[PDB]
Amino acid sequence: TPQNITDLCAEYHNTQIHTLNDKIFSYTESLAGKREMAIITFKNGATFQVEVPGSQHIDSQKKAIERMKDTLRIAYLTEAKVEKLCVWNNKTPHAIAAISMAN
Amino acid sequence: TPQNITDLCAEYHNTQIHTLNDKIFSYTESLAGKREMAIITFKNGATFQVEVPGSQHIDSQKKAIERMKDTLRIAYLTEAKVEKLCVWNNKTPHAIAAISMAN
Amino acid sequence: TPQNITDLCAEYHNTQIHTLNDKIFSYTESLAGKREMAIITFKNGATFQVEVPGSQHIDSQKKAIERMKDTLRIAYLTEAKVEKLCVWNNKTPHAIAAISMAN
Amino acid sequence: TPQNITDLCAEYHNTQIHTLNDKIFSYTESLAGKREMAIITFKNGATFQVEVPGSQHIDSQKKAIERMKDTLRIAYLTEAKVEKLCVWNNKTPHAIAAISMAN
Amino acid sequence: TPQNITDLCAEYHNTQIHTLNDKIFSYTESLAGKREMAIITFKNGATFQVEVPGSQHIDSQKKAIERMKDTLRIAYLTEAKVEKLCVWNNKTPHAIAAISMAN
Numbered sequence A, B, C, D, E: 001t002p003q004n005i006t007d008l009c010a011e012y013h014n015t016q017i018h019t020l021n022d023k024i025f026s027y028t029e030s031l032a033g034k035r036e037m038a039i040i041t042f043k044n045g046a047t048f049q050v051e052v053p054g055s056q057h058i059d060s061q062k063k064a065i066e067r068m069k070d071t072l073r074i075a076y077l078t079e080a081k082v083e084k085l086c087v088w089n090n091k092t093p094h095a096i097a098a099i100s101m102a103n
Helices: A006-008 A061-078 B005-009 B060-077 C007-010 C061-077 D005-009 D059-078 E005-010 E061-078
Strands: A015-022 A026-030 A039-040 A046-048 A082-088 A095-100 B015-022 B027-030 B040-041 B047-050 B080-086 B094-102 C015-023 C026-030 C038-041 C047-050 C081-088 C094-102 D013-024 D028-031 D038-042 D047-050 D082-088 D094-102 E017-023 E026-030 E038-041 E047-050 E079-086 E092-103
Touching: A006 A015, A006 A082, A006 A095, A006 D028, A006 E026, A015 A095, A015 E017, A015 E092, A026 A061, A026 B005, A026 B060, A039 A061, A046 A061, A061 A095, A061 B060, A061 E026, A082 B040, B005 B015, B005 B094, B015 B094, B027 C007, B027 C061, B027 D059, B040 B060, B060 B094, B060 C061, B080 D005, B094 D094, C007 C081, C007 C094, C015 C094, C015 D005, C026 C061, C026 D005, C026 D059, C038 C061, C038 E061, C047 C061, C061 C094, C061 D059, D005 D013, D005 D082, D005 D094, D028 D059, D028 E005, D038 D059, D047 D059, D059 E061, E005 E017, E005 E079, E005 E092, E026 E061, E038 E061, E047 E079, E061 E092
Parallel strands: A046 A095, B047 B094, C047 C094, D047 D094, E047 E092
Antiparallel strands: A015 A082, A026 A039, A026 B094, A039 A046, A082 A095, A095 E026, B015 B080, B027 B040, B027 C094, B040 B047, B080 B094, C015 C081, C026 C038, C026 D094, C038 C047, C081 C094, D013 D082, D028 D038, D028 E092, D038 D047, D082 D094, E017 E079, E026 E038, E038 E047, E079 E092
């Protein structure tokens, strides 16, 4: 298994690492039909989503999508520094695949 | 895919944005039959609900409704500032579709 | 839908409002068979339960019963002020139907 | 329904009350197969388990077992004082049936 | 049942105890397909995973794997000291089987 987010991210196509080293500036979540998603931003203007679950996702990802939204909410509320995000860059906003937190 | 709450809200019929920029004043939840819901208020008097799950909701919204009540409870307890709510205005109290949190 | 806990409470028989305006003094939880319940008290001694799920409950209430126990535990640990409880008074201890928190 | 943990405990065979009036000293949890359980200790050395779910358990206890592990973890992390435990004493470590927390 | 993490760990083949007595330095989680996992590190460089649920795991472990990831997240965010990890050391990074928190 990968030992860090960068190596993990590199195992997939259409991804990139963003380095934030900053707490989340805003947290948005929606229960509206077909937009059951979360959106975060950072003070540098960067915006990211956790995608609406869809046919691109495999079954094993469903619980992990829900966990990620849990993680972003509590990170936001505790002002935890986000080190890096692994994202898919073929979506707008870029779609979160992985998160690391440090410092 | 929308990049913020305002753009997301605009995709739906019978919605509007309320700007609060304030912590939640009160949090109420019920387990009584047919009233399994949450109600929040702000010190300006504004009252909002998370609706009881019903036939106006698609399968994908059900988990998101449960998440929203989780979010409102922990926002209330941490005194997190609510920036905006996207609501359906064809319900009373107006029914929450989305929330953004920021300072 | 109801604007507040008092109006919600009045939609049901065998209920009353207790106004506490105080934090929970004690929290008790059981996994023992046929007693899978929570009990709370306030400083004055008044005692309330979240009932064991039973025949009186409709299916939609089951997730709400679990949420209520989650709410009581975190309210207890954070010393959140409980404003009101809506309770069924045909049980002993009185059985919680709804809770409002406000500072 | 019982008004408190001591009365609840007395409804069962093979139980006793431990009065700790102390925070949890250590919290242990395992995902290893057939040992999916939690263990806590107190500074006095007293050790308690949440049992692995088994044939002795009824369906209604499954969620409550998960909830108790949730409760012990957050009590441990918040340094919440544990008042009493109701335990089954026909197991080693003694198996938790119920917990009370008070200031 | 085992009374502590060291004795639990010894019940299994291909395990060892690591003694950290330190808070988690970094927390990483992924929702990417086939890498639905968490990774933690300590400041001494030690790196550990919660393995992706697979066919090595029995059904009772599935909920416990999710719980473990919940625990590591909240331990990280609260700066809780991790005492020991029981790991399988036939995986790289070593795969977490159990955790103890004290002190």
